[PDB]
Design a protein around this ligand. Sequence first.
Ligand code: VPZ
Ligand code: VPZ
Lengths: 133, 132
Amino acid sequence: CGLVASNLNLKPGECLRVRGEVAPDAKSFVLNLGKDSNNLCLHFNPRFNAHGDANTIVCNSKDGGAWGTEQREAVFPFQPGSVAEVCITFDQANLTVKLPDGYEFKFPNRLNLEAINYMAADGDFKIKCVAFD
Amino acid sequence: GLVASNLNLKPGECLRVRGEVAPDAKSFVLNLGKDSNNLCLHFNPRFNAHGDANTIVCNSKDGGAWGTEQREAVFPFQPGSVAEVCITFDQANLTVKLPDGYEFKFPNRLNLEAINYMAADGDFKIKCVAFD
Ligand SMILES: OC[C@H]1O[C@H](Sc2cc(Cl)c(F)c(Cl)c2)[C@H](O)[C@@H](n2cc(-c3nccs3)nn2)[C@H]1O
Ligand SMILES: OC[C@H]1O[C@H](Sc2cc(Cl)c(F)c(Cl)c2)[C@H](O)[C@@H](n2cc(-c3nccs3)nn2)[C@H]1O
């Protein structure tokens, strides 16, 4: 139900910046990147209290519609109600995610896409702006 | 160019779009509406295209059919430059604010509850989009 954008043509090394406001009663939110809705090089899913987890970032891939292996992070710099900006870039080996407090983590590049063409937002986060390199 | 959907832009809300006009630009397009066949605003600055030079052409599209064109008398765009446009609407008009602060109105002929669809085309690369 959040924004869906296509034809992004984000190349390796280029930065996608997304700013939004976390809902005051947020359970979780999602940013999806990839080729299309069924082929995601990154599903980024901060969980405040959702899907079994509390204050945990869960990332995954999706390939031909099938979820890959989950990856959980050790940090959670989100707060209900607060503005948050996330920055994402990739190379052939990994995506690098930069979180609102400057913390960076890597997620393996599983799909080998030439470019990221698709983004989508969902859950308890209102997008305020998106910047493309 | 970029296509966005599920924008849920409500009356009174501002959409800001910043992009790069190509150095050899002929024209560019920003479309807003419900879907590609139902546009409350087709915003088409023509440098040299479609018969016009340095002219903004606007139109609507309804069930795939173009409406009556409107042309502006000012052209604050330059090839090979960054350009920003800001758009809002109410039931009567869309209001477009151009890079030099010039504003004009375009009648709202579809009376959509919300703008859900945006697309860019031609010689413009979107760099940033904001919703406030
Ligand atoms: O791995 C990422 C996913 O985990 C589970 S499904 C699942 C569960 C298990 Cl135990 C797994 F082993 C695998 Cl591989 C997947 C979520 O339900 C999914 N999810 C959240 C959401 C939204 N959250 C807010 C708006 S939409 N939409 N889909 C996704 O985050
Ligand atoms: O009115 C808006 C349009 O005018 C003509 S069609 C037209 C012509 C006349 Cl004489 C009319 F009386 C009417 Cl009602 C329509 C353009 O060809 C269209 N157009 C531009 C473009 C692109 N330009 C860059 C990339 S895609 N793709 N379609 C559209 O701008």
